[PDB]
Structure formats: structure tokens, C-alpha cells
Amino acid sequence: HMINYPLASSTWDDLEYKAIQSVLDSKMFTMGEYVKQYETQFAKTFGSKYAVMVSSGSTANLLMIAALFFTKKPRLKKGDEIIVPAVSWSTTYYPLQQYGLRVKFVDIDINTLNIDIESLKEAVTDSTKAILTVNLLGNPNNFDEINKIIGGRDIILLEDNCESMGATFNNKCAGTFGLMGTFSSFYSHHIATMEGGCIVTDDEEIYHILLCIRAHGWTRNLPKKNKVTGVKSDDQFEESFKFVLPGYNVRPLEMSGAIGIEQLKKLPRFISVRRKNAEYFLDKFKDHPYLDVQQETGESSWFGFSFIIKKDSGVIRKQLVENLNSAGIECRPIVTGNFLKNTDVLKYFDYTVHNNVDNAEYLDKNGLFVGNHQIELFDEIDYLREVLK
């Protein structure tokens, strides 16, 4: 089928192409100046003390988890219990498996698409070591409630903010609530640097650990006085060749950093347009006869538009999809649907399901999603509405 209303689009203009050119002219392609400047603007934009740019949102999630094992007083141990929602991207879960964590799956709230608060209440026990929240499709989690659950205990809160860059809750930026928050700059995300991801944090030790684990486990990117090795020697013959933590090579490219700088400047505008489209969309689908929309928490950055076929509406997903496609509208499942359906990969995990994941299953069979862009889509929205009659 020929597609006229696509999920994705370009966020770039001449500015980004000019930024690539500068990099080319510099003849310095390895992670450097631009990446650093990008990191600095990144932390500033979102209201976090530190930011570390990585190769992808997936590698951001990887470093996020790994980091916890390397604190002077390790924050995590093999076998520790971590709670996650049943709907998210695959790379939200893999690192948990890769680090030998015990995973506890919690159902989602069918209206918000986020972790079900009532379920979470019950799922958290004395054994819960961390909670890994995911801000789905631009919609932030209700952190106030989440915080009420933790009730001051020593439970780490983490956020995969790969789909909700720019969302806010209580006037605070999503991604900044947790000990760490991850973002993604892959093609067609709120911003795009070809490939790219970021980790934000306010913790200095964690920040130093990240700088180390991102590139070979060395000390080259650490300050003379750092929280990992304390004080770096002055003998570079020695110093430059020391390895202290079991890391990776997940450095981003300088180009991505330079592009990111341009993208960040435009973010306020992107969020604005996306939010205006959302408004229009909600108005148009307000009392839809057989489709429910996502219920907003705080100020969502509306990554895209989800629809859930109403219970006993007798509407069949398959037809809708055909219908949309035939109409030139691109569509997809809501992320990966119920992650628990992936039995082959789950064989590798040490996990458990809290209660049931009835909502996740429902969504899995009755949900779908269409794109939202940083471009006015009023016409596309009128048409979509027309098609979904």
C-alpha cells in the first residue's frame, strides 16, 4: 500500500546539514568537542546535573543497569528484584537479563498505557530492589503516586524515557525523576541524531562510572579527581593505559553530537507542534464510538497516537488495520504489545508475573498506533477521523 500519512518524518533542516559539514571540515570524527557540548546543553535543557551521550537509547539502557553494579557500595546484585511494566521496547528488558536480575512484571493501566498503579502497590515488597518505569508514547508516569508507594524506602527508581523526551509532570522533566533516566535520538524520535541515546543523572559517582564504562573501562575521560579511581596518576604512559571497570565501547559519533546541538535548540518548537496536534486529535476523537485514546498524565510529549478498540465493540483489529493501510495511513502495534508473549526470549530470563497481565493482553490484540509529528497534521487528523468512522 501507498503511504501518505507515515509514522515517521525528518526533523532536520539546513542547520543540521551545516553541522555535519563543520564536523567534516574539522576532520575529527571521534567522540569529542561537540559531544561534550551536547551533553552540557542536554543536562541544562532537562534540568539534570549530568548527561552522558551513548550510541543508542538501547545502549543507554545497558549502561544504566550496569552502572549500578559498580558503585563503591554496589546498588545492585545478581538475583535482585526489579519491577517493570509488561509493555515496552525489548531493550528495556534485555539488560536486566544480561545482568542476572530477577524480573517482576506488572500489568499496565489500560487508559494511561503506563504501569498500573494499583497493581504496583501490591507488587512492591521487601524484596523489591528497584523499579524500572517507562514513560510510554510521550506520557509520563504519575511519579507522585509512585513515590507514595516507595514511601522513602531504599528502592531505586529508574526511567526509560526513550519515547517521552520533553514530557513533564509537576513541572519537572520526565527522565529526571529517577536515579537515572534514558533517552533516545534515533530516527524519528522527538529529536534525531541518526542513532543516539543519553543517560541523565544527578549523582556524581554514577556519572563518573558512566564515563568509564562507555569507553573501554579506561580512565581517559575521567577528571584527575574522580569517584572511580580517586586521583589519576600523572604518568600517561601508565595512566592512559589503565582499565578499571568491565565496560564497553558504546561511544557516539562526533557527528551525532553536532546534530544534537541543532536539534535541542528546536525542541521547544517540536514539543509545541506535537502538543497542538494532540489537542486537535483529542478533540476529534473525544467521543469515538469504538476507539479509546490515551489518557494524559501531566504534559505528554505525544510521541504518537494510540487507539484501543472498545470492549464489546465487536470491532476487529485486522479490519481496521487493513482499512487504515488501504487509505494510505501507516500504522503499527502499540510498541511491542504484550511483551510476555515472547516465550522464546523469556526462556532466558529469571522472571515472574505479578498477578496477571490482562490489560497488556487486551492491548496486544486490540491496540494500534498512528504517527504524531513535529509538523501540523490537522488535515491528516481530519482524514483519519473520516476513515475511522
Added chain:
Amino acid sequence: GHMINYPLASSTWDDLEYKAIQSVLDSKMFTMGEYVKQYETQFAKTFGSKYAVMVSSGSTANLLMIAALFFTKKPRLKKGDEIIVPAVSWSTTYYPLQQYGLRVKFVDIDINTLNIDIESLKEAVTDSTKAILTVNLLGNPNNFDEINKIIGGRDIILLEDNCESMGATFNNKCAGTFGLMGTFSSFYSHHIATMEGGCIVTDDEEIYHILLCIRAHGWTRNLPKKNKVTGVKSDDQFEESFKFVLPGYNVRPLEMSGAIGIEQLKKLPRFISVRRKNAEYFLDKFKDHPYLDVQQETGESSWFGFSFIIKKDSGVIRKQLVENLNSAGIECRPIVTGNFLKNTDVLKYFDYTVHNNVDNAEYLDKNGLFVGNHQIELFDEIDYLREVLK
């Protein structure tokens, strides 16, 4: 702004690579795609392997190489399994082993070749040994014929970290193709450079498909309809496109890297030729050095760079040589990381053992150094080097 008479590194690019970048820009398709696929094809063809998988770095190539072994239908490796490694290599040759819960057995190197000591290897191999991860150091291949005699038909997996020896050959066979898998790096200043980049080669189809899956989200999108991981892919796109079967990563390379890579491979043969011609000259000048030993060549090395080990009982202090090189405008480095076993802090995380001792690695650690080799003639530079190292 360096004021350097003899640099460790240099750029390998010309107008061709720049043109290649322009071409991707124009296409507006930045995510791994056609260029990466062409590159992989050319890559496999160039070294004589059936398959090639481009990754974000040589470090992630290594990672996936180890990871793939846990995912074969009949797992090739399991937690606690013993893997042998030489004591001198890059840090990322080691980490994946740790990350996968393997038991690491460090073996000393040969002080002449700088590769794993064959005699010690003989003694190091037991019935518990499940795999041997060889490293072709500084362009120099391992003697696979001897290694092959050591495995002696037992069921031990041979692997290769070929991140420094792209283009080396042994008995008419390309380094990186000897083991079940071989890794390469296209990072700045390697034989070829694509900003950042890595590759895995293999002749095993099942492994190839496992690699395609774990490189990108553990999904099925990059797998053939009929493949070794899932057998046969559904036609239902809303369904098949969002299915995750293996615990992987996102280590894809950028489409730009593949485009640049295509140009570099063309030049590769010339690069190797120039490096070998520099080496022939270097060797002639240093073969009889009074206090420095050079790398003993095995097969046809690709001479990544030039190593030096101070002769025993020479009365020459490394620190002095370095100082001398530096004032002379000659960049020098330790040999790779030197003795990896000296990194006690990081070792704490490992489940390892040392076979016998690492006396050679310790010697090299304290008495070795390296200067660069490039794809440009260095006659004058070598002459100067010899003058400085009087």
C-alpha cells in the same frame, strides 16, 4: 598543532570517502541499510568468508561474538565454561568473557612474536578447555597450524580477535577466517577507518543469523524468511515485525560507516602493500639493533605498528627511551595495554586463573614500546628513528 616528526596515526581518507559521505546525505537514509549490506558483502568476499556482519565497533564485534555462542540451538558455551586467552590484548577482548560468566584462563605470550606462547598453550589446554580466543597482535598472525595441532581434534572452539591484523595471512589464508568467528575494527587509525566500526566474519549460517538478530533488538526484521533462529517467518507483518526471540542489543553501525567502508576496502590492498614495504625497510635497519628486539614475523604480517622490547641486561631504561623519542618529535605508546594482569581492580570482577606464570607479559610491560606504521611510505621517518635510537 602537534610539532610531530613521526606520528602514531594518520588519516586513510581521500576525496573518495568524502564523496561517499555526500552520497548518503543526499539519500537522506541514515540508518543501517543498503550501504552497510554492500559493505558486508564486499567484506566477506575480500577475506574469503561466507558471511560478514558490520557492528558499531570492534568492541561490540567481540561482544556479539561471545554472545552468539550462548544462543545456538545446541548452546556452544555456557556459564562457567573455560576459555583461554593471552595475557596481552585490548581491554575489550576480555570484558565480554566476564560479562558472560566464563571462566578465564590467561596464558603468557611469546616474547618474540608477541602472540600466545605455543609451548605454554600446549600445557594450558585440558579437557575442561571449551574455547581458545586468539588475538593476532600488531598485524602478526598466530601460527594456526600449531594451534590446530594442539586442539588435536578435540572439541574446542577457536576464536579470533583480528582487530589489529586486518589483511594478515597465514599459509595463504586470511587472519580472522581461521576461527569459528573472527573480529575486526575499522576505528580511526586501523588498517581501514570508518570513524568507528567493527565486523564479524563467519562461515557458519546459524551463527550468521544469530548475529543478525542480536545486533538489532533481538528481532526478526533482518532475518531471511527461512532462517536458523526462527525457522520460518510469518507473513503477518503487524505480527512478525514486533517479535523478539533472542536477548540482544542495538549495536548497529551507521549507514555512513558502511559507505565509507566500501571505499576503504578498495584501497586496502595498496595500504597493506605500503605497510609491508615500510616494514621490510624497518627490519633492515633494526634487525641488528644493539639493545632492541623487534617483532618476529609469522606468515605475512599486516604490520599495524612497530614494537620494540629492550634487550635483557642492556642497561637501557624504558623511561629514558620514551623521553628521548618525545623530545625528538616521535610518538610512542606501550604495546597495546602491556600486561593486562596488572589491572587488579578490574580483575576483581573476573572468574579467572593464570596458567603457570606471565613472565613474558611482565617483561614486555616494563620493557616494551611501539611506534606507528602507516599506509604512506616512512623511509625518512624510519631513518630518523634509527638515528634517535642510537
